[model samples]
Target chain A: TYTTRQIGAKNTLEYKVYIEKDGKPVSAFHDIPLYADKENNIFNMVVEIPRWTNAKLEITKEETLNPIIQDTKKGKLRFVRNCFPHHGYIHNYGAFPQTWEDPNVSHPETKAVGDNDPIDVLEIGETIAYTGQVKQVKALGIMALLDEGETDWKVIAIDINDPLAPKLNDIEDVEKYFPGLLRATNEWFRIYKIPDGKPENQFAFSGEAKNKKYALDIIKETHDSWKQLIAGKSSDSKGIDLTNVTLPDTPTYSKAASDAIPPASLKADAPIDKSIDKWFFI
Target chain B: TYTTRQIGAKNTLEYKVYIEKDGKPVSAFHDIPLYADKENNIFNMVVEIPRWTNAKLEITKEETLNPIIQDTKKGKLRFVRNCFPHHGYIHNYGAFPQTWEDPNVSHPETKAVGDNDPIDVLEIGETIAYTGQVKQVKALGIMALLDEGETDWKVIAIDINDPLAPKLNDIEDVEKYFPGLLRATNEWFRIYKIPDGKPENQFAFSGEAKNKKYALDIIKETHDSWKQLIAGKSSDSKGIDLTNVTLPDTPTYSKAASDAIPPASLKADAPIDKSIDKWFFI
Candidate 1:
């Protein structure tokens, strides 16, 4: 289990989130392990935005400690569009830690460069996950979104602790059990950006969901890419801060921050934008 | 170059249809060729029901001439549910000529027996084909529906003459060009019969659309099944009328009908039910 600490000025673009394990500050990006259960292909995902929420919260790779921060565009906070029947995010939208999409590398099939971020996970479970909460998930399938011509892979997963988790094993299982969900997820991604005055998103493989084995294989590839990024082996890291608090073998990791047990509080939460409630029927 | 003729009395369950080629009476089910252009996997489809129509017209296996007729349930003409936005059938719906699904053999993956009917085709093109028109089409993808434990496969294709048909060669192309169509097609099959007091249909491959190659392969398999049904090799043909006029190598085929040109007169078209216009949002 991990604890969250508020960092920087609240509600501002600089406002961020950092994590601590048993009072010891640990880098949420570099310190958290990718797999919670390697034997079962169960991965660890840091939930950034829960279901039905429009806030575009993501890990700030450019910041030290890699705190979760609200994404901004044109000096304003970014919120995804609400596709009908669902108010906001269709699933517990998050990303797998220790997995990076190497921007310099292009996907073999799509021939498109990476989005320069970690592989995203959409937890399709019944329960809503808390922000910054690391949950164990079973990676079922993946969808390749061609975001502005970059390979932004979205891995479909389920929280292992969910009631329906045991019975669901693959992409087909999700479609059978949660009828219309697979299609809804694809539609959410396609139109969510349209409300921002951006064109609809395109998907690789003609929007077909790749099976479970394909998802796990891609996760491992991204994990390898993350190792290259953190170890300064990648062609370009985009100057992303790699500073960690006690992550073993990482050059930027420090033991002092773990012992100091620093940070938080009295930083009142910022007001959320009201327009995040807007819904589109497309 | 096939033609349709009314056979039975109008409006009632006895109302039936028959076909002829070049002034010769021929069985629509057994005499018509399956492939239009075999080299390109193009097929000859008999348009039983045009796009945006609710009449459940189908080839009558029980009738000797095997004419396309409106299907019935408990003496009532069957009509599909209009899934919203689509007033009736989403595509130019029909069936591939001379391809029957053998009921005895179970599909390897689904382990389900066939529906004992010709493989169904849904033409996803721009043009509205007339009923009984034989169209040359490109097979792009397929969806397998489990109706009452029977494998009912729906082949997705496009008329070769359609404006966009030249570029579409795979299942992904359909998703990319016709946004939300593949999803809508699946949803239609899943809920179309719910109004008739029937449960939602289940699908193989978890509702995933199989690619072009898979579609072609399955079509060929059903074509082979049709040969067996005609040649009296199948374990069960469900007492279907295998009688054919001028179909080569078939036991029931008669050479006399090809030269004699014996057939229909002014048997007026049946009245379609007004309730077929009803739509459902789901």
Candidate 2:
């Protein structure tokens, strides 16, 4: 039973959700295992932002022992726009616990180099997950989003506890059980950044969503990259603080002997931007 | 070399494009073999209607000898309407010989039963093929159009002699080389019959075009159905005329000795529908 502890203030850049394992603090990025069920191929998903929420929260590799922190830009906390038709995010937006998309690695099909971010996930389950919530998800398909000349592959998944989980074994099953969700997900990803004055993101394979077998191959590829990154082998792992508490025998796990955590403050939440609620007509 | 004799007149239901081997008369649907090069798995394509044409042409099983003839509706020759941005048929729309889509057989993916017609082909080479033309083509992909609950699998291919043939190996290659063609083909198949007062066609997998492996497997299944047809084993081969001049050992191949040539008539072509040339706004 993995758990989390809230530190600092909510809805602000200072806020960080730290990881714990039965009163013992662990690194959210390293301690969390990639696979939840090895036999079923279900992966552990660390949801940074839940459905219908606008707070742009994520696990920061720049921080020590990686904690869930609110993303900030221009000296202020960042928040994603609702993008009309969608309240916030249509699904539980998250990332795989131990997968890294190495920028130096070029995929065979698209040939678009990776975006250097951990592989993103979209869990379209019935329940609305919370920030720092860990869920076991079964990957159904993947969409290759060519964002700003970088290949950002988004794995479409569903929580095993989801009501429609049994029905959705493949990509087509998602269309069969929950119609228009995949199409909506595709549209949302393409235009969401447009509200921020950025160009609409392009997709590889002419925006074709790949099948289950294809998605698994990509997940394995990212996982392998993460292994290289953790072992101090990746070329572009400079900005990422290799301060991990788990797996001590590895080359980069030097500071695990004196792992420490700061106390959480009992302060009030910070004021959110009113402009985050503004919806675009398009 | 295979040759064709134009019987009756062009652009009319009575017009049948008869097949010939050197100087001997042959059935267009049967005598011509399916494979051009079995080693490459390339199939022979029978062009019933060339690119940018309106006359609705097909090889009818209802005739005495299977001949590529103009399709009819309400005792008149039929012609497809021009959807917007498309003049007429976008590709060299045709069918495959020695292959039949058995109505009794249901596909695994779509779960949609066959349309009882031959498997359709879309040859997107740069050439404007002539009627009754034969070309060896490499199958790139397939799209399943569910018309009135029956599956009409459209095999997407390109002629080996064409310029784009060397670059295109699979379905994704089609998307890369010929950008908007696949999307336009999907839209065309869905709404082409809307101008004719018919309901819009539905597609399986949300109109997602299939890859090479899936396309080749479907082709094999159709060819197997055709084999069952000639051997008098198919349940629904009641009205089809099995008369052929080739493969004498087959049980259904009969009365090959007294085959006589039916003289081609020299007649003026019938009046065509002017509306076929009219452009649609949508």
Candidate 3:
């Protein structure tokens, strides 16, 4: 159980993500074919980025989530990574904000597992510690199966700097923390916000870069990949959007704060910890 | 592919090894179900052992050109961390050795990933060196399938100490090293000999232990398992034994080695790299 609270179905964005193993095209990371949900809120999604060689991803499905991005063609509502601090805001926030380069090739900027450096973890007697870069993060998603009968609206937010979250400087670190929350990202909105002070961060924001389009593209491309997958077109696992899918946008609760709890197929009303019950653990 | 001459099939063993994972029984290490021929001159076979678990193997069959321990009930061999050194021929020539207990559970003698102070090479990225312990070797039945007519008997002996073998202290090392020998054993036999000055080190010495009962049990058991497998009574990739089945073991050159190559149908040989094949950094 978490010490945090859940806001059901709060965030929703459209984007696509890809997986790159070593330098060549390998199998997709996730075993599931596709994921989509308009009901429950999603906090964060982890994508495995292998060390060495070239590994990049392309954002492809910005059309269905919003025809406007394709209609405008300005790419203005584009994206970026978390280089700058977003100051806990949902938009135009975070340090080191910039435009995302080719998600198709292994970026030189990303720390890789070169001959000298590794993106893997070391196994200790009972503990596994980080020895490489962060390759994957723990992520949660909510899909709207039924409106009132099966699901309901909810709010969610993520804090990258939370200590409870997976601390990954590289891929090896991804294993050090539990797969669920070491890479934990709580979907919260203020049940009540301090006048001016921000909610103590709850996101594992260190390892990933931030960009608006980057976030949007996460959902867009993921959606495109999903279409292909459902049509039996793609077997690749990274063919879905993860970031934008969790963004705080439309369906914003009328009376809910960033951390406000809501009723849904999944109970998001209690504090994240109390709500965890016996079914959850990071 | 390697600096050392990749010996073709020589003295190799065909075993039906199995393991259980996630509490579900599945073949984890040494999953070879068939052998092409006993006279194929195979040398080595490989066993891939996973981390953190106990393993059990039932030697259903043992095929060898030159017979060793031929009993089946006693053929059930166990491979655990640092086990062979305590029971190897160097320790017990013909005596049925009992399993020894280690006092340190904090560091149990069994092989598993992340155990403190492992046998070394078993861990990823550790140096490749032979750490011959009592548990490192398994006495086997090596056979070669002749390319032309029938399978021939090959010497079943102790695999020399090769620490680089996978699962260093566990069974995986046996799997990796076993197949290659089955592919080509004579070649390996050429270079592999017990270190000099050992108590009794002869290529094919019949100690008082090599009696008729041991040979009969091993032979009948090997044949029984083989028949069961072909008749759907067994599930193994270690191949059927052809000795005395498809060919006669009583040959014209039983005293001295014969030049006549056996039938290819009956002979099974492993692929061996006479030398090491380096990847990437050369």
Candidate 4:
């Protein structure tokens, strides 16, 4: 009933985005089919949660890659309550629709540990995006997180039209302009699972590539990976090599040397005055 | 009635912590008086939010300095709902029960704009501290934030006996051992205002001093500030000065130069295929 239309010299894939009603396709969000351009890397990004909030709204679905039309069919939306007593997310966090991370061809380190879900993203910009609102984004870097033995990649991107857009080229550039953002990104991944009773998880900069080239390559690979997965080529996570992977060159921790020091309470760096407690006055 | 007892070698102020019921103090959270030590900077920290999650809890009060004891008289606890949609706090976020930020002696930048309340804190390391649980903490670094024209300071510290205690001495040391924690702290402050439609707040490492010595000085200053405020020495904000204050020397943002780049979508760096949309198959 549906056919893919290759458009222009770019050969962008044009596919339907159906709006279901009562378990039947009734209409579409966009009258025209969604465009997947290779050169542009542009697609409709469905925002679940806008910037700066604690509630989480995931685009739930039966298939990992495709959009969840059921929720769109029914106007009811769902959000996950916060399990901890902390601040809300510090940035515009969301996901790329129609994108998937193939478990079979994940990075060598997380080959069999790939999280079978759509590629996640963190959009940095001045604009506050809305749920179900589609926007154009440019990939700048990759935040590779190992979530419970699975490779959960958070693509660091920015709204193409943001004031800070042209300045960011890769993760290093992010560190330069954003100063502490990369470290913050790493912190979010490490501690987000603390309430769940899970210890800190291991993470890295880019999976196989630490720069923009690798980020772009990853987007392409994941896109191809998704296609292969849909074509039944995704079987298992074995023999997949991530030779292009590169970790940070500098010591990840700045104060690693000082970590050896024992607590001042344990080792008396300053003399404890035994009679100091007598100062308590009513 | 609770009595204060000056106990042990140090001139620690050990005051009784009574649990309240029906607008009256009934029992005590701790069996004995809570020790407020000068040498160790230990105080009764009332945990509003337990470990893990993003929702933040503030020890609300009226005075610019010193903690208000009235809230402890009521059994009903309060929590501010995070305006942003993101993860709950990532640490044991709470406040010092008897601490306060004097509006009069606040830094020159915030002169009278001080957020008249108790000083804020974030407890790190491997500990799932509970609400209403009092713990001893050592000041490490000061996270100075100018939130909506008010001076809000968050002391970055570890539990007194925490294994990671000795390693962190100041803000610089935090970046070293904690890896991404300092950055995360900054990120939380910078973006926390976005969801409220408030612009980014100006922030720095320390209030007057960005290091350990300064952090300790601030604790002492706030203590004195509270005493001064209570004694009615706090008058108008006109005569106060922060001439001895020093800010972090490092560039806050690395890519400030590239911030000048114009939007890519506005330029022709990448060819835009306009006809692609025309080929969209309905």
Best by DockQ: 4
RMSD of each: 19.1, 23.2, 23.5, 21.3
The C-alpha stretches of model 1 lying farther than 4 A from their native spots are A8-14, A257-262, A266-269, B1-282
- Candidate 2 on B157-180: residue-level lDDT in tens? 999987679999999998787776
Off by more than 4 A, model 4: A1-38, A51-56, A63-90, A104-110, A204-209, A229-282, B1-282
lDDT of 3 by residue, A163-263 (tens): 43334333234333433222222221221122213333221223232332333433343345333443434434233322222223313112122122222
List iRMS (one decimal) for every candidate.
Answer: 14.1, 20.8, 23.2, 21.3
Candidate 1 structure quality by residue, lDDT tens digits, A123-225: 9876667778889999999999888788999999999988789999999998777777788778778887776788888998999999999999999999999
TM-score of chain A of 4: 0.60
What does DockQ come to for candidate 2? Answer: 0.01
lDDT of 2 by residue, A178-252 (tens): 666778778888998888888998888778889989999999989899899888888879598777767786675
Off by over 4 Å in 3: A1-43, A48-282, B1-247, B250-282
User: Residue A139 in candidate 3 has what lDDT?
Assistant: 25
**What TM-score quantifies how close candidate 2 is to the native fold?**
0.50
DockQ of 4: 0.06
Best by lDDT: 2
lDDT of each: 0.79, 0.80, 0.22, 0.47
How do the residues B164-259 of candidate 3 rate in per-residue lDDT, one tens digit apiece? 432333323333443332222232222222221113222222211233223323333334433443343433324423222111332211311211
